[PDB]
Write a protein that binds this ligand. Structure first.
Ligand SMILES: [Zn+2]
Ligand SMILES: [Zn+2]
Lengths: 382, 382
């Protein structure tokens, strides 16, 4: 084991990790190193077995945990991708099925209209064929009895004249046709925008946080005003004392929601959202610092937005005041957008919000003064 | 034939158009019925046989005309309904296929991102599996060979420790893709609106209708402005001699067309259309009496629409001046609509018209004065 001394190696050296023999351990690479009796070295390196064992166990457990974490990340990426697939598929199939259903319904309606028109015009065709047959019969009777004996002619003259006069009073005078248009692109685009809104969140009013000026009925969907006094309020933060406003029964914190409100003949009103952690009683201002976001319309032509400032902002309204407004709320983007829902098939934008939200929020509605007699117009909520 | 006068009928009675006898017309049923004899009256009132024949022929011809009208109405309504069915179905299947294409493109993008993340995480997983195999091998070798004879045990202890120290050189570092949103549908809607416009009619310019003050080149596809003296013009009705304007070679009168134009750095310019059945030469204004609709930009930030009035309507201008505008022309609805084409994938409406449908129209484009030195800004055309 030595190649130099014609004798093998028999002594190990730990601090140089090298095997040697007596001659090499006498002159050269080793004389007094961490040589071994095997006894001192065995005891000294075996006493520290649990240290290395514990380090190995630490490394093994840590790397197993790392493997599990990475596998969990892989699974979570798979879940995210699959959820993305499903959500995109549903949100595009909504429009796909809407367009397909509309096309199929219109095609079936056109087929039914074609059948009805064919039936009517075939009835008219049968009537006209009968009329032509009667005319030919009368002509042949005339040409056959015009040269009969005098007695038969004098017997039949009046009769034939009366028959002609009677049969000359059964005849239909015949523009009554179905219509088509070229604005299909714009109408389909706008109606698709309309039908892409989420479901109408069925909101009902909440009287526990309302002012006793307005009155609510119709299964919590209708609210109007009266002309009678309300007893005074007490001491409670959740009761509205300054503004004549109300919030809804529902409390939304995640997802997507949308609802249309028809105001009808009421000239002055306002809508918006209010944070649940905000003040309901006491002096209140149109400040989002109090968690209130508002948008109001008065006089039928004066629209105003109360953004966070000491000044409202007006907008142009058409000569005919629209009476139905749709609100869309998204908690993900935190966007509350307004659209003109007075047209049942087309919406026109009005206003929108883009902020961060405390969460959650109540949809708040505020009526203007009762006008003392004439503001009995109802307020609906779909 | 009388039961009272023992005589048959021999006298005609005009007020009753009936043959009677004399006695009843003397003391009875025809006291004053203005009697007639029967032979002369029979022949004289019989003279109108060809009259009845001609009336019967007239009625037959009128009802035959009615039959022809009904048949033509049936066939033409059927053809109109079938053509509308086919056109609407195909032009909505167009949107269906567009939605499918967008969904497939997004699916391919998601698949590519998932594949890249999976490749990275699988490389890391394979590395960690190899590391775990090494750890298990080391642990099992130690716990199985820890009880060998002392010579081999002390020979292998150091080796194993050094192997652990060598393999203790692997520090573990311990993917990014978008998720669904609520404006995802709206963005898809906007891209659908952008890409749903009809095909870009590949129209080229006609140099026979340009003023030689500014320069036109590239086979009638490029036109820009210089600051140079202009040679005098010639004689042509379709060629602008007073104003530095140009029209297109093609002349279209039915259907739907759309095109985007980039204006770049030029601050003042104007575009529009001119009716072909109107006056063509001389200085012309945006008057539908001459079938002219215009739209201009000045000061680089002041956009204006030239509707039919004695004033260029000063539309509201955005904070960012757009440098690419798309124009859509529909002859059916007679609509000239403007859109913001600065976004290469989404267009936003600006204005529209609903007016006279003269037919056909020349697309007219007018550049302002060369300003003699500073109006060297180019004019692009996409
Ligand atoms: Zn030796
Ligand atoms: Zn008689």
């Amino acid at each position: 084991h030595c190649e130099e001394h014609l004798d093998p190696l028999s002594i190990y050296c730990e601090q140089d990790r090298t095997l040697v023999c007596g001659v090499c351990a006498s002159l050269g690479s080793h004389r007094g190193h961490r040589l071994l009796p095997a006894a001192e070295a065995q005891a000294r390196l075996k006493t520290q077995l649990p240290q290395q064992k514990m380090q190995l166990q630490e490394a093994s457990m840590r790397k197993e945990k790392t493997v599990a974490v990475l596998e969990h990340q892989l699974v979570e990426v798979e879940e995210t991708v699959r959820q993305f697939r499903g959500a995109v598929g549903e949100q595009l199939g909504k429009m796909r099925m809407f367009l397909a259903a509309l096309e199929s319904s219109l095609d079936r309606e056109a087929e039914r209209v074609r059948g009805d028109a064919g039936v009517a015009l075939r009835r008219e065709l049968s009537s006209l064929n009968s009329y032509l047959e009667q005319l030919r019969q009368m002509e042949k009777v005339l040409e056959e009895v015009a040269d009969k004996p005098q007695t038969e002619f004098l017997m039949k003259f009046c009769l034939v004249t009366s028959r002609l006069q009677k049969i000359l009073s059964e005849s239909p005078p015949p523009i009554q046709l179905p219509v088509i248009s070229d604005d299909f692109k714009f109408q389909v685009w706008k109606h698709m925008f309309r039908h892409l809104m989420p479901a109408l969140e069925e909101l009902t009013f909440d009287p526990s946080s309302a002012h006793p000026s307005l009155v609510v009925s119709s299964s919590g969907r209708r609210v109007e005003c009266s002309d009678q006094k309300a007893p005074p309020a007490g001491e409670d933060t959740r009761q509205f004392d300054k503004a004549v406003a109300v919030v809804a029964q529902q409390l939304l914190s995640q997802g997507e929601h949308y609802w249309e409100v028809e105001v009808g003949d009421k000239p002055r009103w306002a809508l918006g959202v209010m944070a649940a952690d905000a003040s309901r009683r006491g002096r209140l201002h149109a400040v989002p610092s109090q968690g209130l976001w508002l948008l109001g319309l008065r006089d039928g032509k004066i629209l105003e937005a109360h953004v966070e400032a000491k000044e409202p902002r007006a907008l142009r309204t058409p000569e005919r005041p629209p009476a139905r407004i749709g609100l869309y709320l998204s908690f993900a983007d935190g966007v509350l957008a307004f659209y003109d829902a007075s047209n049942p098939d087309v919406l026109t934008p009005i206003f929108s919000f883009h902020e961060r939200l405390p969460g959650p929020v109540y949809p708040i509605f505020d009526v203007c003064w009762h006008d003392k007699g004439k503001n009995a117009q109802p307020l609906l909520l779909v």
